[PDB]
Amino acid sequence: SMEQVAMELRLTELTRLLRSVLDQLQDKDPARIFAQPVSLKEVPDYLDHIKHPMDFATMRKRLEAQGYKNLHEFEEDFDLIIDNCMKYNARDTVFYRAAVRLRDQGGVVLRQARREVDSIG
């Protein structure tokens, strides 16, 4: 149908906008602490602690499959990155501190993304 196409064009454009958001959030992680999945070879007990691991490469895979239907779903995954880290790692670690800085800096980007998503529809 023509409606299914129009819906698919909306999803494609959302994917465009979320790709730019993702790039901007990932720039706020210059140490690349959140770039890849925590290694189960190197942290073999991780899944005993963290039930839903997340990282920027995994989000990018979902993004490119047009797997985010709305901004809420994308934000859920970004919040998992931060929240998982703040639980597994102690306050006095470079990892925890990196997550706090990513959360704080990302807030700004996500605030305007929400306005754009609502604005453009």
Side-chain angles (χ1 to χ4, degrees), residues 1-2 4-6 8 11-15 17-40 42-60 62-68 70-110 112-119 121:
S1 72
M2 207 32 251
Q4 289 301 316
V5 169
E8 293 161 358
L11 179 60
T12 298
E13 285 309 297
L14 175 64
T15 306
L17 177 161
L18 297 181
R19 191 177 304 113
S20 168
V21 175
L22 184 65
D23 293 341
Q24 282 178 74
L25 295 174
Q26 189 153 27
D27 293 333
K28 308 313 179 155
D29 176 29
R32 296 194 74 82
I33 290 162
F34 306 103
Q36 293 292 333
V38 170
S39 171
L40 305 174
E42 304 168 1
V43 187
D45 75 355
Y46 190 66
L47 300 183
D48 293 346
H49 293 268
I50 297 303
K51 298 297 166 179
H52 297 100
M54 191 46 53
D55 66 273
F56 288 131
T58 301
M59 293 185 60
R60 196 171 294 280
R62 184 166 164 191
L63 179 65
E64 293 312 332
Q66 303 191 339
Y68 294 116
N70 51 57
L71 181 58
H72 180 74
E73 290 184 349
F74 177 96
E75 292 174 317
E76 283 195 332
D77 272 355
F78 177 66
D79 286 338
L80 275 176
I81 293 177
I82 297 317
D83 292 341
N84 286 348
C85 185
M86 294 177 70
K87 295 168 187 66
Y88 190 82
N89 305 107
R91 227 159 18 253
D92 76 325
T93 62
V94 63
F95 308 106
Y96 186 112
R97 290 163 173 285
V100 164
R101 293 164 60 82
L102 179 58
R103 190 198 59 188
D104 285 350
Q105 293 191 279
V108 181
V109 172
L110 290 173
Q112 204 49 44
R114 161 54 64 207
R115 292 193 66 86
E116 281 172 0
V117 165
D118 292 0
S119 189

